[PDB]
Design a protein around this ligand. Structure first.
Ligand SMILES: [Ca+2]
Lengths: 56, 250
């Protein structure tokens, strides 16, 4: 997987590494799930999410 | 904002209102608890920097509902390449005197990484622009925060369709050429925010245009991806005495 196509499959940030290696990363206030691509909030008010809509 | 809608209260929680001597100046975007991104041109005519206030959690300017948080602006940082009175490099980074408290109505927008912004966010067609600016060209400003969905153009296409300042690599065009929908005076400094896989990111700053919603013309926005490294370095630096700081760019 390469970061210029489909964001390397990452939900947020993507780094290309030497070989056929790819590492996804997340913004501060998020952690990467074991799927290696998804990010989940680690704080009450992570950046870029709208609390009243996340509650519904 | 021309041809938009009222942003429901709390749905634009990163929006900032900048005031000087209590009067509406410009918009801005919260990106952390003490940092706001706005437009450099908003500060061309400030005489006393101690009269500059940022308001978070604002929605309706006619009433105080208790979700509003006001902060003195401690530093206004502008790139060395910005020239007062002109359009290029139209970005400012503001440090608040005290942090805002994050709440359901006050949340920062994500400042993306450069590569992610250039490779992925730049190709998301539609993004949201917001502010309390003029509702019409030569018209009154909004009492409630307004929001508008606008499509982004490649700069070649913007020039081919526009029928003047150049569109530089530090800018992009977005909106509609039919005179119906645009950001306007008073919206300057506010966010152009892009949604990608469940999260919103800062991609632009309301900067300039030909009048507002002028037929044959698009809105022009500061291309924030060019400034990510500049911004990140400043946010890692110690404060310097004196409100205004010119910082080398790149
Ligand atoms: Ca209010």
């Amino acid at each position: 997987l390469i970061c210029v196509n489909e964001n390397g499959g990452c939900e947020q940030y993507c780094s290309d590494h030497t070989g056929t290696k790819r590492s996804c990363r997340c913004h501060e206030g998020y952690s990467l799930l074991a799927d290696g691509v998804s990010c989940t909030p680690t704080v009450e008010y992570p950046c870029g999410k709208i609390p009243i809509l996340e509650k519904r | 904002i021309v041809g938009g809608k009222v942003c429901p209260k709390g749905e634009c929680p990163w929006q900032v209102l900048l005031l000087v001597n209590g009067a509406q100046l410009c918009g801005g975007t919260l990106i952390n608890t003490i940092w706001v991104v706005s437009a450099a041109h908003c500060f061309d005519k400030i005489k006393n920097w101690r009269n500059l206030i940022a308001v978070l959690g604002e929605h309706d300017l006619s009433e105080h509902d208790g979700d509003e948080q006001s902060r003195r602006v401690a530093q206004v940082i502008i790139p060395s390449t910005y020239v007062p009175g002109t359009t290029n490099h139209d970005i400012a980074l503001l440090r608040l005197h005290q942090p805002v408290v994050l709440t359901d109505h006050v949340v920062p927008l994500c400042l993306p990484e450069r590569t992610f912004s250039e490779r992925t966010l730049a190709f998301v067609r539609f993004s949201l622009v917001s502010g309390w600016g003029q509702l019409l060209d030569r018209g009154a400003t909004a009492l409630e925060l307004m929001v508008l969905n606008v499509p982004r153009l490649m700069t070649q296409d913007c020039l081919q369709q526009s029928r003047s300042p150049n569109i530089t690599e530090y800018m992009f065009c977005a909106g509609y050429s039919d005179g119906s929908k645009d950001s306007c005076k008073g919206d300057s400094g506010g966010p152009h925010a892009t949604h990608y896989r469940g999260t919103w990111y800062l991609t632009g700053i309301v900067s300039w245009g030909q009048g507002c919603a002028t037929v044959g013309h698009f809105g022009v926005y500061t291309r924030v991806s060019q400034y990510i490294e500049w911004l990140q370095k400043l946010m890692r630096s110690e404060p310097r005495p004196g409100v205004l700081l010119r910082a080398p760019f790149p």
